[PDB]
Nucleic acid binder design. Structure first.
Lengths: 159, 186, 200, 191, 59, 51, 173
RNA sequence: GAGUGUUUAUAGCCCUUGUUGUAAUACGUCCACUGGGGACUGAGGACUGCGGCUUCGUGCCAAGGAUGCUGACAUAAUGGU
RNA sequence: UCUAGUGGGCCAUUUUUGGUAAGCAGAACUGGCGAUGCGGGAUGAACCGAACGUGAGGUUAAGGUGCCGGAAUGUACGCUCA
RNA sequence: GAGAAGCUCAGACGAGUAGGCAGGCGUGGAGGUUUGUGACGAAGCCUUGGGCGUGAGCCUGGGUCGAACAGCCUCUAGUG
RNA sequence: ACUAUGGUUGGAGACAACAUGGGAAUCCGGGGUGCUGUAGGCU
């Protein structure tokens, strides 16, 4: 008895947060979006116009079109053995910037600064990231930190 | 038991021509040695195209050769043009320039017009004699998708391809499914 | 090459003596000396190609462990540690010593040149493959594998995965339990050396 | 193994439950009284029926009424039937209670001189329940979450005041004036 | 009995040839953009091409 | 070329063709030509035999 | 084959805790890897440390100080049966506390069908006084005048000569 | 002959330390350190590709795949049906 | 680009729904049989091991070592008389 | 040189129903070719003999037999 | 607590232990009771 409505099985997906109903913060309408920006789609239940489908909730895409009150987001969805391009017109109330883009920008700026300093001082670059390295030898001391001998505890009910 | 994925294992290229033309076999024999004993990629390209089928070797016109070799930013004044295929004649080109063209075969009209215009026609073996490594040669090929099958290939909803019809005009696939006045459009 | 081998051998002995002396100093002074966590890990696939989940199968393909009794060298970082955690039931891994590394590369040493498995019967093959990384012999190839250097990725990828035989004396009573439980799966620390010795 | 199926606006026509009284004996006892507690815990997951719950409750009450008197026990049933079991007609059929690990079924608080018969009552009623059960001498003071030694130590200071069956305790919050007016014997040391 | 829907083999069938990603192109069609934006960009590109061609010719 | 693989660990000639240092390699060299003391420590011994 | 290891570990120092406490325990494990695994298994019960959030700073095998003298070992253990968790105390006469532990594991497996995973060794002590030795069968071995015949076995095979299929005469005892 | 109740006597146990310890033994690890016993294989088919000895000899070698010395049979033996 | 066959599925682990339950019916994940031979579970489509060109030698997996049956009437500690 | 449609070196791999492709074996007839076979025995048939190929199949020794038959390159089909 | 992965683990089962990993909530206790620009006025 499945139903294929637009907002089917969206009882909790579109719900406002607890003690977060009512007025919508106005900084969302002041955010600036440009073509090529990486944005996150998070549907707001208070706004029904421009509502994207439940599939695109929690999905990250690239802005391709900009209108008066909404934005065009490009998404890739699996339709079997291939990805398909989906162009969703979403109002800015359901659109937020991805903080990963800002982190990427900060990383690039840091890399450029280190590269400029290395060129000026004639030193190495050493800019690529590294995974969690193995631990180096330390010198764990015992003074004022005498080891405490432990033994398994016997079975004693506490009820 | 070994867990190895075999997807691009058997090569899908041609290692020899499908035709039985003895003269084409001789040309393949010459250019096999040329491509193997020279580091020039021109010889390898010629050898690969010698294997190609007729549909993969479209003809090219003398007008197309003249248009490509007479570009402003081309610097192609008196160098040889190479086509692995047939050179046809474009009668719309009333005045043929002087061209040096090497081709697998020429049409009678194209060869006559090239010779009349002060140009020269050479075969692939003659081209190998003149330019063993293909130096200063303009290598071209005909339009592969100019064939009639490619206007039908990829037909489907909203693909704007040519359908397979037995005739032309109304009463032939210009009804429901092809206009908004009849149910839906494409 | 001989001078390089002499320097490598002296470096190995110096490192071993330094570790021993540091441990002795810690024991004498009553403190604790925690040594460096290992950087090189030898991984042997113990499970066949039957009934493998897609994620574990993909990891073993990316680790080039596509056959039972196959061994590879990896550098131990967070990414490889998590991958080995996922494929824990199907592989064993541990810290190999110099004897295990050199015996593997001398007996089962096969390089990948032109996507072909060619035995390392001459230093010319190694020099041709890895000469741009100053690896001209089996000895400095062993040095690069043992001491994880700059071109460890190239040195380890050049070596074809080792095709080990079945262990002499067999495995434990049940093979597909964890090493802690008494099986032959998961981390076994230095016991990988004994396993490789039986499997070589 | 089925999901819980209680009575609601979607499952209305359900047969009535069988156990109506869950407390038997001196319900209005005191915290100072009954310094010993006995619990009948379950060591495995069960699906105890309301029929078994009422039968064991009746058996326990009829055994307790003639060994120490009607005013010596506070037997309480700690299992409530909330799951509806359906049956195709030969569609609710009955009501059962789902019991987890270490859940108490029956609780009796008595004096230290009645511990043997308090254990015996639950031992006799163990035969009326499906599965296995255990009898535990609770370390807490009756129904109070505190321990016996901790409760008497705090009562010596005066931080606990009885109120009917249970009591009220001193907590580190609330108006100071109300706390002083409600706990006169409590010595509020300045620390 | 009919109506035998299942998804046991569908994931394996999809991954047999993998989940293919669409080809990425440098330029996308302007039919997906705003009509006013595309109309103005036509003239802007036309002037840019004219200016570039004039620069190449004169210089 | 290379019709048959010889194990360097078994064939000394191949073990010499590779690894030129093998001839000059030395092992089992004594390094205990001294008093050779003990580094145990009373604290370490007490912790070891604590319980 | 079991061995006794003393294992000392701690939690990885953090911003709030720059000097974590060091915890030591003695564990009877076949190898060091099992010993460290047992250390983390027992530490997770009381402390909030894990293998990822902790590190082992020492592991040392302990040998018997007097392997050539007979001792009495009292072992307190906590084990899980098919019904509940029990605490037992047992006495074993052995020259090595590791051997006493192995004898304890064999005895528990033989009697209560208890596996290694279901047994926790709470404490092992050496009892040098018969006033604290409580098992009568262990105490009967401490009398100065102890004598008994050889336990009833299958007689002496003596080398390969006992591998003959047939025998010319009946055996004698 | 059956029993006290003081600690080496006509014996000796247990726990500390000094010493002649670099005193020894088991265990782990390594040796490009060294001895034997057994089995299967001998693919390739003029030469070409490293180390040592110098006898400076496109000489020798276990170094890019077995040769050498013998014997018995030959209406036997090994093979095929 | 062209085209074949398919469009009755079934078994096992795990998560479950309807049923008293079913070798029942209907869903999700993974591995399989279908199309999978071989060693083991005495016998077997699914279970364990392991995925197969023709052979020699060696070593194993799961499983076993009283005989049938290849392999210790092996070692150590206990329990049990039905 | 090695029927270049050839010669030579090296590495990896090998389950398979429905189904797809390629290379081959066999039969009848047609064109070309083989100083082709044959009444001093063609075809066919029997065979407790031999040989080749992984295989479809092929060659051959010994009997019977009496009048036609085959190899190679192509063509073709009422071809297993 | 719960949970991903494993066993020819235990148990008749329900479930439980163990092994390699991840890791809550309610309660209780300690602390706190808003931060943030431009242009100007006030013994």
């Amino acid at each position: 008895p499945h139903s294929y409505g637009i907002r089917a099985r969206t009882r909790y997906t579109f719900q406002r947060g607890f003690r977060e109903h009512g007025q919508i913060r106005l900084s969302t309408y002041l955010k600036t979006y440009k073509v090529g920006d990486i944005v996150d789609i998070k549907v707001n239940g208070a706004v029904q116009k421009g509502m994207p489908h439940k599939y695109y909730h929690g999905k990250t895409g690239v802005v391709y079109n900009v209108t008066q009150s909404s934005v065009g987001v490009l998404i890739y969805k699996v339709v079997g053995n291939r990805y398909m391009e989906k162009r969703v017109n979403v109002r800015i109330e359901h659109v937020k910037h991805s903080k990963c883009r800002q982190d990427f920008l900060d990383r690039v700026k840091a890399n450029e600064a280190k590269r400029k300093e290395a060129k000026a001082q004639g030193k190495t670059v050493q800019l690529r990231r590294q995974p969690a390295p193995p631990a180096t030898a330390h010198f764990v001391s015992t003074e004022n930190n005498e080891p405490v001998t432990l033994h398994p505890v016997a079975y004693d009910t506490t009820i | 038991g070994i867990d190895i994925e075999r997807h691009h294992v058997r090569k899908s290229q041609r290692s020899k021509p499908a035709s039985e033309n003895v003269y084409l076999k001789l040309l393949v024999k010459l250019y096999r040695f040329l491509a193997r004993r020279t580091d020039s990629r021109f010889n390898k390209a010629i050898l690969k195209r010698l294997f190609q089928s007729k549909t993969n070797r479209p003809p090219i016109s003398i007008s197309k050769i003249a248009a490509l070799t007479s570009r402003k930013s081309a610097s192609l004044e008196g160098k040889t043009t190479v086509i692995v295929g047939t050179v046809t004649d474009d009668e719309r080109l009333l005045t043929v320039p002087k061209l040096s063209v090497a081709a697998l075969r020429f049409t009678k009209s194209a060869r006559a017009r090239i010779l009349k215009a002060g140009g020269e026609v050479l075969t692939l073996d003659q081209l190998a004699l003149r330019a063993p490594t293909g130096s200063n040669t303009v290598l071209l090929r005909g339009k592969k998708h100019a064939r009639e099958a490619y206007r039908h290939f990829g037909f489907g909803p909203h693909k704007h391809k040519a359908p397979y019809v037995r005739s032309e005009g109304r009463k032939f696939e210009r009804a429901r499914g092809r206009r908004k006045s009849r149910a839906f459009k494409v | 090459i001989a001078k390089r081998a002499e320097s490598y051998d002296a470096e190995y002995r110096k490192a071993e003596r330094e570790q021993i002396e540091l441990g002795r100093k810690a024991r004498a002074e009553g403190n604790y000396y925690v040594p460096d966590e290992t950087k090189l890990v030898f991984v042997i696939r113990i499970r066949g190609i039957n009934n493998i989940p897609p994620k574990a199968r993909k990891i073993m393909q990316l680790l080039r462990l596509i056959q039972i009794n196959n061994g590879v060298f990896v550098k131990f970082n967070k990414a490889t540690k998590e991958m080995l955690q996922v494929v824990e039931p199907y592989v064993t891994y541990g810290i190999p010593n110099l004897k295990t590394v050199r015996e593997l590369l001398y007996k089962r040493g096969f390089g990948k040149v032109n996507k072909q498995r060619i035995a390392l019967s001459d230093n010319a093959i190694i020099e041709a493959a890895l000469g741009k990384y100053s690896i001209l012999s089996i000895e400095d190839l062993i040095h690069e594998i043992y001491t994880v250097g700059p071109n460890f990725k190239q040195a380890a990828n050049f070596i074809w995965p080792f095709q080990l035989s079945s262990p002499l004396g067999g495995w434990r009573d049940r093979k597909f339990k964890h090493f802690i439980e008494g099986g032959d799966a998961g981390k076994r620390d230095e016991h990988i050396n004994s396993l490789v010795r039986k499997m070589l | 193994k089925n999901k819980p199926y209680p009575k609601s606006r979607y499952n209305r026509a359900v047969p009535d439950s069988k156990i109506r009284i869950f407390d038997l004996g001196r319900k209005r006892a005191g915290v100072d009284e009954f310094p010993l507690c006995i619990h009948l815990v379950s060591n495995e997951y069960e699906q105890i029926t309301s029929e078994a719950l009422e039968a064991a409750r009746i058996c326990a009450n009829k055994y307790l009424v003639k060994i120490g008197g009607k005013d010596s026990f506070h037997l309480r049933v700690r299992a409530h039937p909330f799951h509806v079991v359906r049956i195709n007609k030969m569609k609710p059929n009955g009501l059962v209670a789902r019991v987890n690990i270490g859940q108490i079924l029956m609780s009796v608080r008595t004096k230290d001189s009645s511990r043997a018969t308090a254990i015996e009552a639950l031992r006799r009623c163990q035969y009326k329940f499906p599965g296995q059960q255990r009898i535990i001498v609770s370390k807490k003071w009756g129904f109070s979450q505190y321990a016996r030694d901790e409760y008497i130590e705090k009562r010596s200071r005066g931080e606990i005041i009885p109120d009917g069956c249970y009591a009220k305790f001193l907590n580190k919050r609330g108006s100071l004036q109300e706390k002083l007016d409600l706990f006169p014997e409590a010595s509020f040391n300045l620390a | 009995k009919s109506k035998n829907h299942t998804n046991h083999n569908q994931n394996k069938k999809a991954h047999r040839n993998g989940i293919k990603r669409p080809q990425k192109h440098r330029y996308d069609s302007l039919k997906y953009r705003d009509a006013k934006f595309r109309r103005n960009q036509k003239f802007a590109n036309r002037g840019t091409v004219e200016a570039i061609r004039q620069a190449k010719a004169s210089a | 070329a290379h019709v048959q693989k010889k194990n360097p660990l078994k064939n000394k000639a191949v073990l010499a063709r590779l690894n030129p240092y093998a001839k000059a390699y030395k092992a089992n060299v004594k390094l205990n030509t001294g008093k050779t003391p003990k580094a145990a420590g009373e604290k370490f011994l007490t912790v070891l035999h604590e319980n | 084959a079991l061995k006794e290891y003393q294992v000392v570990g701690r939690k990885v120092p953090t911003e709030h805790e720059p000097v974590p406490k060091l915890f030591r325990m003695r564990l009877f494990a076949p190898n060091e890897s099992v010993a460290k695994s047992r250390y983390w298994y027992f530490l997770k019960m009381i402390n909030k440390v894990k293998k990822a959030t902790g590190e082992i700073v020492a592991i040392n095998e302990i040998s018997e100080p007097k392997p050539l003298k007979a001792k009495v070992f009292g072992i307190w253990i906590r084990y899980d049966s098919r019904s509940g968790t029990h605490n037992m105390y047992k006495e074993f006469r052995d020259t090595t506390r590791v051997g006493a532990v192995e004898a304890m594991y064999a005895d528990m497996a033989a009697r209560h069908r208890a596996r290694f995973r279901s047994i926790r060794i709470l404490k092992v002590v050496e009892v040098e006084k018969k006033e604290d030795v409580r098992r009568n069968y262990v105490k009967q071995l401490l009398n100065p005048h102890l004598k008994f015949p050889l336990p009833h076995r299958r007689t002496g095979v003596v080398g390969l000569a006992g591998k003959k299929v047939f025998a010319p005469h009946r055996p004698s005892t």
